[PDB]
Design an enzyme around this catalytic site. Structure first.
Site, PDB file in Angstrom:
ATOM      1  N   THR A   1      47.055  17.457  59.248  1.00 35.11           N
ATOM      2  CA  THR A   1      47.731  16.949  58.064  1.00 35.11           C
ATOM      3  C   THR A   1      47.489  17.783  56.818  1.00 35.11           C
ATOM      4  OG1 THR A   1      45.868  15.439  57.744  1.00 35.11           O
ATOM      5  CG2 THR A   1      47.809  14.581  58.872  1.00 35.11           C
ATOM      6  N   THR A   2      46.347  18.463  56.721  1.00 31.57           N
ATOM      7  CA  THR A   2      46.103  19.326  55.572  1.00 31.57           C
ATOM      8  C   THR A   2      46.811  20.666  55.723  1.00 31.57           C
ATOM      9  OG1 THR A   2      43.924  18.281  55.471  1.00 31.57           O
ATOM     10  CG2 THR A   2      44.325  20.158  54.028  1.00 31.57           C
TER      11      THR A   2
ATOM     12  N   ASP B   1      40.186  10.405  64.615  1.00 30.79           N
ATOM     13  CA  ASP B   1      40.472  11.828  64.746  1.00 30.79           C
ATOM     14  C   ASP B   1      39.874  12.423  66.014  1.00 30.79           C
ATOM     15  OD1 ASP B   1      41.284  14.384  64.282  1.00 30.79           O
ATOM     16  OD2 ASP B   1      40.038  14.718  62.509  1.00 30.79           O
TER      17      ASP B   1
ATOM     18  N   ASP C   1      40.699  13.410  54.620  1.00 26.98           N
ATOM     19  CA  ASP C   1      41.864  13.686  55.480  1.00 26.98           C
ATOM     20  C   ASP C   1      43.125  13.733  54.667  1.00 26.98           C
ATOM     21  OD1 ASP C   1      43.795  13.670  57.525  1.00 26.98           O
ATOM     22  OD2 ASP C   1      43.239  11.702  58.310  1.00 26.98           O
TER      23      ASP C   1
HETATM   24  N1  LIG Z   1      33.491  25.274  62.378  1.00 24.14           N
HETATM   25  C1  LIG Z   1      34.632  25.909  62.027  1.00 24.14           C
HETATM   26  N2  LIG Z   1      34.637  27.229  61.756  1.00 24.14           N
HETATM   27  C2  LIG Z   1      35.764  27.871  61.407  1.00 24.14           C
HETATM   28  N3  LIG Z   1      36.960  27.271  61.298  1.00 24.14           N
HETATM   29  C3  LIG Z   1      37.100  25.950  61.544  1.00 24.14           C
HETATM   30  C4  LIG Z   1      35.913  25.179  61.929  1.00 24.14           C
HETATM   31  N4  LIG Z   1      36.321  23.911  62.109  1.00 24.14           N
HETATM   32  C5  LIG Z   1      37.654  23.874  61.859  1.00 24.14           C
HETATM   33  N5  LIG Z   1      38.116  25.088  61.520  1.00 24.14           N
HETATM   34  C6  LIG Z   1      39.519  25.417  61.180  1.00 24.14           C
HETATM   35  O1  LIG Z   1      39.948  24.641  60.063  1.00 24.14           O
HETATM   36  C7  LIG Z   1      41.338  24.350  60.198  1.00 24.14           C
HETATM   37  C8  LIG Z   1      41.692  23.001  59.580  1.00 24.14           C
HETATM   38  O2  LIG Z   1      40.776  21.970  59.944  1.00 24.14           O
HETATM   39  P1  LIG Z   1      40.652  20.625  59.064  1.00 24.14           P
HETATM   40  O3  LIG Z   1      40.949  20.968  57.630  1.00 24.14           O
HETATM   41  O4  LIG Z   1      39.322  20.000  59.385  1.00 24.14           O
HETATM   42  O5  LIG Z   1      41.779  19.612  59.613  1.00 24.14           O
HETATM   43  P2  LIG Z   1      43.354  19.940  59.620  1.00 24.14           P
HETATM   44  O6  LIG Z   1      43.561  20.727  60.888  1.00 24.14           O
HETATM   45  O7  LIG Z   1      44.003  18.582  59.620  1.00 24.14           O
HETATM   46  O8  LIG Z   1      43.585  20.728  58.359  1.00 24.14           O
HETATM   47  C9  LIG Z   1      41.651  24.414  61.680  1.00 24.14           C
HETATM   48  O9  LIG Z   1      42.810  25.226  61.879  1.00 24.14           O
HETATM   49  C10 LIG Z   1      40.450  25.070  62.326  1.00 24.14           C
HETATM   50  O10 LIG Z   1      40.857  26.257  63.006  1.00 24.14           O
HETATM   51 MG   LIG Z   2      41.224  18.255  61.596  1.00 25.13          MG
END
Ligand SMILES: Nc1ncnc2c1ncn2[C@@H]1O[C@H](COP(=O)(O)OP(=O)(O)O)[C@@H](O)[C@H]1O
Ligand SMILES: [Mg+2]
Ligand SMILES: Nc1ncnc2c1ncn2[C@@H]1O[C@H](COP(=O)(O)OP(=O)(O)O)[C@@H](O)[C@H]1O
Ligand SMILES: Nc1ncnc2c1ncn2[C@@H]1O[C@H](COP(=O)(O)OP(=O)(O)O)[C@@H](O)[C@H]1O
Ligand SMILES: [Mg+2]
Ligand SMILES: [Mg+2]
Lengths: 529, 40, 528, 98
Positions: C90-91, C391, C57
């Protein structure tokens, strides 16, 4: 000459003393090297032909032990990747109790074999997925290999032959005598409900003649003398007290107030005559032995000797509670005579000398007690500690047999048979994962290799011979030890069997610790302090 | 095996030892100095 | 100027002040871009003590990497002010700011004032927010929808075999404690972790788990039906506030005072015993006492003769979880004891794990405060799971409190990119450069996802943008084939409030950074 | 190499040279009490760090007065205390025999 500057970005913002290892050639290939060194240190102590190790910690205390977990506990490790392999081994000690070296050998072979796959093109995600698929297959084949389950856990002729394998793996040569001591003590404290407890077996070490002089004793023993003058009672009524044996004082700050000369003369005589009635009240109930856990008083000791009562002091709290279960008494928080249910009945309480050590024995003639102790005697303080751990492995084996009575053929007859069935499964899977499943099966040959190298025979001929017999169908063929030439031998007939639950948790924890190291890509370490 | 000077006793390099006859002659010479002061 | 007044000063004038903020912003993004999506890689964190922390995270990572910079401290505080409000995003916060400063530098380096770009960010921020209102879809938020939203935020911080197990325990817990009105109140889902067994045994318990048991060896370990008495009264020996002291005489008056000082505390115990003997006349029910203050060994011997399992020194938060669960009243005094103030459970049993003791409360009538039990074989495994649980719980509370959900998979960042292009000509002046630069920064979410899966960064965007001109469908990026896929019919869903706060935050910080003139350090070296 | 397993200073030895160097370490303990055996034995004189002299012919007290720090040789000092606790005589006959 010229100097190469620092690349702009994250490298220019790091604190001094910190390090950053990112990539596949700097983080993954170096983590495997640290974990491969750890497997070569504890491998020498595998099997009946294992060798001891002299470890000295930073308190200048010396350890001569053969346990895999004990060696790792007294060794400091400063590699993060090698620290997960240690914590994976310490978890099996608390769940099963036996099989700490299997995790190090298995997690050392899964990781090393994954390095070769990473150079032929396979990605890290393909290796992780391949190992997990193989891990589930072994958990389905394993129940089909169970043979010779336990019959009766209350027979002294059957339980003794089931713990022998655990002892013989740690004290070779003395495995026949030592197995008769643990079996004599576990069945004595085994309740009817079947709920076995490990803390009900006690070990006391008295520097003496030799190992063959050790004996079991239904009761408790203490490294203390007797406070009073009476030192032997035939049929005693123990009245355990938790409060100190003296007059009762208030917790608030209280003082006497003498205003006349007449009250000054009677004060000293009043306290003494008050104490005579309290001690005589207990003496009328037949309580020959009074056990306290506090401070004894000088005036209270006088009346104890007057009525032929035995006074023993134990200032260890939990050691007092263990006595209440042995004799069947209750701790009194107040200095009042017990009525009917707070009087423990023993069979003999006496003070004896064993190897220049004055001890108090709460002997019982009945075999059905709550707590049983094992008296260990030897010639060196190091030799007794090594046998202390070997006893604990035998006790922990009895607890597992209570939960699951299923057994498997040991001595390498399980890993080789698991290598044949997994290898054939991977042949039927077309794709990039068939290379990982095959490498999982070859990691099961590291255990018979470790038994053959430690014995003094050529290992390559052993696996060559084991694979031919198992193909015919003999799944109960392992490795011979007494034979000078690398021969083979049947294990069910010989009597070398391991617990099913011991190996089921060994594979699960070993694969979990091996797949977490591969997932790491970047390492950010702080300044050591 | 190269039997290097392994350590046996603590502070081995600050300790001395006399044995055999030379230790017996040192006692006599020490007791001959004391007894010759009290002769007078 | 300042160097003449204070020689021990450090200053950065003209464009040297903008070269430090741009360089460091791009340094934090080259490390934070490998954590995006379900295909990111795990990181190892080792402190000076020697502990091991595997996290993914962006908030936990930023506060653990050894970084000492002024302008890298501003971004760190923005991410913290998002984790405690929304709990997700946060990322993506660091990536957008790091790229928004990169695009704006291409026009500043060409001889253009940074204020002209600032006016373009304001116009582009107002159009993007007006476009998001018409993309969100308002649904009922039934159980089946909350499964999909919770799974999207759990499949990126654990593997697939765990997210399928943790999704059911998070969706069920929120529903059990939600009423038909009032906002969902947290602090009512206790997160208990026990270091044993495997990580697939993480379950949901309809009750409460307490990390302590009974302190007497003569107390019951299994009651099949019990009354829960939650109290905050003291049964320890206490002393008068004003300084007192006994003044006795011959040894008979000392005995009349030792048992006369225990009457005040033995009266409270005798009120409980009569209450127990009244409601439970026959030995068929139990009676469990949970206290927030201590109990003397003397009072543990009076209660244990009637089988009153008693626990001491509970946490203050558990005086509120035990009333919603059972249904009693947490009382402070014993002068109004009545059977109406007692709870009810169905099974209270003790669990001992080595040197620690646990107590289970199960089979409650209508529980309103459930607990989560975390199991794992490693210390860092219980911390990795505890991050995902937090989360996944804030991703369900947000989906319920707002009756709308936005599709994910990057299908929405492409949509603002096309909308802002047709709005570029409508803005007069040189401020069209702000809108063009803003539309380029939003396209970093599809780029990082396409790059982390092992595809081409450019050949994938042209395929995604080939759609959405010829078909009005919110098409995202697939993470296994690289083909354009529709995110609304597969299960990928995001939160409306997460994307709304992210746009507001990433513009205010990158607008103040671009207007910084110089970095002056003229104060005292250290507070001494 | 950049990250090392054990601390800096962990001395380790193994093999045939490790075991032969232990047999030669017990030859020094046995030779310290070799000449106190029989009716014609001679006692020794040991001095502490303070200056107190302890003059004795028995193995058990001689081996207690030496600050032996060798881990292999410390086994021979531990069996002497065992003999003087069980029987009380024959202490210097188990040191030459070992
Ligand atoms: N299974 C998935 N397939 C495609 N995109 C995804 C999937 N899960 C999450 N995402 C995309 O990844 C992005 C970032 O998610 P993540 O890095 O897990 O946390 P954060 O939103 O804090 O960066 C989100 O905007 C979401 O749209
Ligand atoms: Mg997330
Ligand atoms: N008599 C024997 N012959 C062959 N193998 C044996 C014999 N006794 C024990 N073994 C094997 O030695 C293996 C290792 O035992 P040990 O090293 O003591 O503990 P761990 O199981 O923790 O490695 C066991 O798996 C067992 O199968
Ligand atoms: N009269 C004797 N003639 C010859 N040898 C003797 C006689 N008496 C005792 N010994 C020998 O002297 C030895 C005594 O050794 P000693 O210094 O007492 O060793 P320790 O103090 O360990 O017992 C015995 O082993 C015994 O064999
Ligand atoms: Mg074993
Ligand atoms: Mg003698």
């Amino acid at each position: 000459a010229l100097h190469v500057p620092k690349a702009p970005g994250f490298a220019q913002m790091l604190k001094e003393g910190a390090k950053h290892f990112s990539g596949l050639e700097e983080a993954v290939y170096r983590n495997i090297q640290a974990c491969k060194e750890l497997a070569q240190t504890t491998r020498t102590a595998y099997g009946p032909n294992g060798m001891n190790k002299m470890v000295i910690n930073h308190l200048e205390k010396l350890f001569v032990t053969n346990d895999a977990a004990t060696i790792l506990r007294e060794l400091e490790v400063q590699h993060p990747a090698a620290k997960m392999i240690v914590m994976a081994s310490h978890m099996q000690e608390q769940e099963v109790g036996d099989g700490t070296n299997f995790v190090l050998v298995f997690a050392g072979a899964l990781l090393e074999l994954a390095e070769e796959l990473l150079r032929i093109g396979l990605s890290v995600s393909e290796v992780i997925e391949g190992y997990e698929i193989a891990c589930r297959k072994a958990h389905e084949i394993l129940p089909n290999l169970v043979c010779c389950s336990a019959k009766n856990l209350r027979d002294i002729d059957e339980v003794s032959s089931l713990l022998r394998t655990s002892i013989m793996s740690k004290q070779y040569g003395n495995e026949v005598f030592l197995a008769k001591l643990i079996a004599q003590a576990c069945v004595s404290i085994f309740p009817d409900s079947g709920h076995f407890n490990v803390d009900n077996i006690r070990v006391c070490k008295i520097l003496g003649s030799g190992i063959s002089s050790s004996s079991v004793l239904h009761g408790m023993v203490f490294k203390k003398e007797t406070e009073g003058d009476v030192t032997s009672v035939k049929d005693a009524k123990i009245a355990v007290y938790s409060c100190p044996f003296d007059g009762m004082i208030t917790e608030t700050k209280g003082t006497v107030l003498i205003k006349t000369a007449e009250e000054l003369m009677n004060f000293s005589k009043g306290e003494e005559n008050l104490m005579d009635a309290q001690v005589k009240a207990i003496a009328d109930t037949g309580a020959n032995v009074v056990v306290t856990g506090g401070k004894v008083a000088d005036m209270a000791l006088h009346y104890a000797n007057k009525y032929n009562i035995m006074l023993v002091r134990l200032n260890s709290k939990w050691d007092l509670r263990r006595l209440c279960k042995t004799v069947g008494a209750t701790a009194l928080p107040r200095l009042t005579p017990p009525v009917l249910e707070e009087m423990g009945h023993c069979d003999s309480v006496y003070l004896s000398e064993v190897g220049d050590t004055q001890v108090v024995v709460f002997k019982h003639e009945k075999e059905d007690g709550a707590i049983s102790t094992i008296v260990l005697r030897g010639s060196t303080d190091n030799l007794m500690d090594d046998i202390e751990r070997a006893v604990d492995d035998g006790v922990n084996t009895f607890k597992v047999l209570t939960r699951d009575k299923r057994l498997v053929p040991g001595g390498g007859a399980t890993e080789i048979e698991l290598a044949k069935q997994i290898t054939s499964y991977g042949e039927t899977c077309p794709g990039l994962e068939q290379y990982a499943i095959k490498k999982f099966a070859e990691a099961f040959e590291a255990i018979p290799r470790a038994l053959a190298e430690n014995s003094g025979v050529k290992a390559n001929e052993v696996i060559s011979k084991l694979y031919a017999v198992h193909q015919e169908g003999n799944k109960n063929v392992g490795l011979d030890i007494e034979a000078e030439v690398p021969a083979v031998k049947d294990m069910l007939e010989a009597g070398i069997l391991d617990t099913y639950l011991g190996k089921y948790w060994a594979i699960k924890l070993a694969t979990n610790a091996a797949v977490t190291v591969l997932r790491v890509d970047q390492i950010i370490m702080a300044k050591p302090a | 095996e190269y039997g290097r000077p392994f350590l046996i006793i603590k502070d081995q390099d600050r300790k001395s030892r006399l044995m055999g006859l030379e230790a017996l002659k040192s006692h006599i010479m020490a007791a001959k100095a004391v007894a010759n002061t009290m002769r007078t | 100027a300042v160097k003449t007044l204070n020689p021990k000063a450090e200053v950065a004038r003209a464009q040297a002040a903008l070269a430090v903020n741009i360089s460091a912003a791009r340094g934090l993004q080259d490390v934070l871009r490998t954590n995006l999506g379900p295909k990111g890689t795990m990181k190892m964190l080792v402190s000076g003590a020697g502990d091991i922390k595997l996290t993914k995270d962006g908030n936990v990572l930023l506060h653990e990497m050894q970084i000492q910079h002024p302008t890298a401290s501003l971004i760190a505080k923005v991410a913290t002010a998002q984790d405690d409000i929304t709990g997700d995003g946060t990322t993506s916060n660091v990536l957008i700011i790091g790229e928004l400063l990169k695009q704006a530098d291409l026009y500043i380096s060409e001889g253009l004032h940074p204020r002209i770009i600032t006016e373009g960010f304001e116009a582009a921020k107002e159009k993007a927010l007006q476009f998001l209102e018409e993309v969100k879809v308002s649904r009922e938020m039934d159980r089946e929808t909350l499964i999909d939203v919770a799974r999207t935020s759990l499949r990126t911080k654990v593997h697939a075999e765990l997210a399928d197990v943790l999704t059911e325990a998070v969706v069920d817990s929120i529903l059990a404690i939600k009423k038909q009105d009032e906002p969902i109140d947290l602090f009512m889902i206790e997160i208990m972790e026990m270091k044993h067994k495997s990580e697939t045994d993480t379950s949901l318990i309809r009750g409460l788990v307490l990390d302590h048991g009974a302190r007497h060896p003569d107390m019951k370990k299994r009651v099949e039906d019990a009354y829960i008495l939650t109290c905050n009264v003291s049964l320890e020996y206490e002393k008068t506030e004003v300084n007192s002291g006994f003044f006795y005489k011959s040894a008979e008056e000392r005995e009349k005072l030792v048992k006369a000082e225990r009457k005040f505390i033995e009266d409270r115990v005798k009120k409980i015993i009569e209450l127990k003997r009244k409601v439970c006349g026959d030995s068929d029910k139990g009676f469990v006492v949970i206290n927030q203050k201590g109990i003397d060994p003397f009072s543990l011997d009076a209660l244990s003769k009637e089988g009153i399992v008693a626990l001491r020194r509970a946490k203050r938060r558990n005086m509120e979880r035990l009333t919603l669960a059972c249904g009693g009243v947490a009382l402070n005094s014993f002068d109004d004891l009545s059977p109406d103030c007692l709870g009810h459970a169905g099974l209270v049993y003790e669990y001992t794990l080595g040197e620690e003791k646990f107590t289970f409360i199960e089979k409650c009538n209508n529980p309103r405060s459930v607990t989560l039990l975390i199991k794992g074989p490693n210390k860092h495994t219980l911390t990795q799971i505890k991050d995902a649980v937090r989360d996944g719980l804030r991703a369900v509370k947000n989906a319920i409190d707002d009756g709308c959900v936005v599709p994910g998979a990057g299908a929405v960042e492409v949509a603002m990119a096309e909308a802002l292009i047709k709005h570029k000509p409508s803005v007069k002046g040189r401020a069209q450069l702000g809108v063009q630069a803003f539309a380029d920064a939003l396209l970093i979410i599809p780029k990082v996802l396409a790059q982390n899966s092992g595809f081409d960064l450019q050949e994938t965007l042209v395929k995604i943008q080939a759609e959405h001109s010829e078909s009005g469908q919110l098409v995202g990026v697939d993470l296994n084939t690289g083909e354009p896929m529709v995110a609304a019919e597969v299960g990928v869903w995001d939160n409306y409030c997460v994307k709304k706060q992210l746009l507001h935050s990433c513009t205010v910080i990158a607008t103040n950074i671009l207007l910084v003139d110089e970095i002056m350090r003229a104060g005292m070296s250290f507070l001494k | 190499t950049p990250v090392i397993l054990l601390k800096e200073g962990t001395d380790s030895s193994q093999g045939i040279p490790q075991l032969v160097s232990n047999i030669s370490a017990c030859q020094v303990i046995a030779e310290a009490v070799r000449t106190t055996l029989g009716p014609r034995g001679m006692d020794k004189l040991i001095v502490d760090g303070r200056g107190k002299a302890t003059i004795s012919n028995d193995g058990a007290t001689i081996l207690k007065l030496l600050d032996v720090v060798h881990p292999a040789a410390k086994t021979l000092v531990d069996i002497a205390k065992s003999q003087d606790a069980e029987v009380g005589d024959g202490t210097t006959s188990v040191t030459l025999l070992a």
